[PDB]
Symmetry: C3
Subunit: 228 residues, 3 copies
């Protein structure tokens, strides 16, 4: 499978590896939702999402997006932004182990966790405008939730690439570690966050995100308009 799920009495860990660049297509999206389903059933104290040794995620399957029937593309875009909503509204602390580059939907997923760890050399970019695509509204709201006002303008309108210290200052990540310890740090942070009071964490995080979550929902409902 393209997703591995492991857990203990404290945390759950969901690791993406399709042997390539972790495209968020239907297979990968289904595997992720099934993994989060398990962590829901297992009632983990916190949850880690990690990529592979090559990338965090290169984003949506560009073949689906650029050719063929609109319905597969619509469903891929919807399921991807629904995952973001699911993570941004997750009742447990969510830690992202950005184990490689995070591009476009990979970057929006990166911005869907409570704490995000990457290494200095990992490029983070919403490259839509550079490849001829308009960033969907649901994606804009996720970016607006995390980036500084000025980084938001450059990331979206200019397809700007961030890495390490500039990604940290921009609000794309929360912590920098060495590449070989990105995952262990994320697991370690997840354990710390599992020690927070779960009920107060969920109530407070939803207070910090309620308006953004509603706008993300309207963006998901309006996905068809993004195709015309």
């Amino acid at each position: 499978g393209p997703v591995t799920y492991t857990h203990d009495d404290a945390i759950g860990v969901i690791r993406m590896d399709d042997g390539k660049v972790n495209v968020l297509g239907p297979t990968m999206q289904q595997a992720l939702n099934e993994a989060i389903d398990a962590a829901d059933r297992d009632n983990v104290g916190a949850l880690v999402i990690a990529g592979n040794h090559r990338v965090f995620s290169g984003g949506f399957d560009l073949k689906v997006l650029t050719s063929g029937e609109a319905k597969p593309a619509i469903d891929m875009l919807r399921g991807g932004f629904e995952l973001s909503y699911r993570l941004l509204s997750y009742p447990k602390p969510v830690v992202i182990a950005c184990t490689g580059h995070a591009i476009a939907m990979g970057a929006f997923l990166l911005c869907s966790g409570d704490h995000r760890v990457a290494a200095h050399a990992y490029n983070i970019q919403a490259n839509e405008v550079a490849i001829g695509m308009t960033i969907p509204y649901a994606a804009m709201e996720v970016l607006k939730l995390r980036l500084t006002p000025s980084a938001y303008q450059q990331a979206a309108g200019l397809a700007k690439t961030f890495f390490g210290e500039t990604a940290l200052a921009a609000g794309f990540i929360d912590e920098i570690s060495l590449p070989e310890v990105v995952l262990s740090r994320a697991e370690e942070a997840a354990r710390e966050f599992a020690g927070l009071n779960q009920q107060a964490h969920n109530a407070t995080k939803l207070r910090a995100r309620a308006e953004a979550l509603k706008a993300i929902r309207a963006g998901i409902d309006g996905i068809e308009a993004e195709f015309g």
Copy 2:
């Protein structure tokens, strides 16, 4: 036994220094003394106002015993008066400088974020610790944090009870300036004397345009204090 606030002033600034001999808890006595000191600064028509803590802390926040035990009315009245003070400082017609002379925890941090310019030292921990101790951050406090913190720091400070100090507190938007611990107070007074040179009328008008929506949301949070306890 004497009051927990010292007020001094000259022809330019007023200085309000909290010291209850402990951690400057923001209980009924401290709130009353603070409001009385600000009343004095209003009457004296100071050009700017400094709020400072003591040797140990800026403020450790509300009295946790009142919050976790007993009748809701003492708890409700304490939270309301605390967030009312934040409203008062955030809408003060003169520039307000915070001399963060120690750690600022929970309501200590929300008060910290209620002044126009905030000076702290490298080792002073700044944290809204509510989530770590089983409390949901009130709406009035959420609005204060959102007014000043960067988007990502707001998320971590509130949802993860993250602790900030010095350069990371500066980067987060919890403070505006770092000084050595022994010059935090003199630096804050210096800034206050500079800010008193601003045009007061334009300062008040402009700061209120910069805060109108947040203040209204802070007012709504103060009115809904009962909802934070379950009515």
Copy 3:
């Protein structure tokens, strides 16, 4: 003598340079010359647009003589035309690069905040000095400031007339890149050429999604300009 604005272009970018021989006040002449220069860039359909100041400033802001004395109409018309320029640049369908070639004060700073990418040098003061000289920042300008500054920088820039320079201006959101003074303009041109390589239709659509709410509020501030004078 000459006009206060120079417009030149090639097949990729256009460059607009402000130089009234002083501090580039955004009075009626400069504003008209600016709008005419942007009109030319529109006709030429440039891929990206550079706005630059002179060797002394980016711009010192509005004409204070117009603002502080005489009939209200010249002042109102000046304020409106200045914020209309910010609206025009913030909603420009091409990438706009600001070559901040000197200090940028008050409306100069608000204009600086109207481009997509902002290049300055370390020594250049960026400041909305309104409160220090007795003026309330108009609503339209606050919306421009709020679009770009971090929440805390916003509070200090507006309420405290805080001055920003280099790394502090960069961290605040007043600029996006720092260059040595003699390369501010050429670096801005280089960046503008890169940005012309973006997909124009996606850049315009995406930037308007990032700004729609602020632009609506800037329009309301422009409609309410008379209320700023009473």
